[PDB]
């Protein structure tokens, strides 16, 4: 039902964060207080 929608959202970020055509002089910052509850797919070399 309701929950899965947010899943889609996060995926739309990830594949848009990387891929082909180096983004360039565009930098992103991530900040959190609860690191241990993060999806490991975020810690891939090239994304973070």
């Amino acid at each position: 039902g309701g929950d899965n929608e947010v899943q889609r959202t996060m995926l739309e970020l990830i594949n848009q964060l990387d891929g082909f055509d180096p983004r360039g002089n565009i930098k992103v910052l991530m900040a959190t207080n609860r690191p241990d509850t993060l999806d490991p797919a975020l810690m891939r070399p090239g994304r973070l």
Binding site: G1, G2, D3, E5
Partner: peptide, 26 residues
């Protein structure tokens, strides 16, 4: 770990219907 959990809900989008246009152009 047994389950007694709950969940929220998304809405039903399909609500629109067509209507007769009433333009007055000569």
């Amino acid at each position: 770990q047994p389950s007694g959990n709950t969940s929220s809900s998304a809405l039903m989008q399909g609500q629109r219907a067509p209507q007769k246009p009433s333009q007055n152009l000569v």
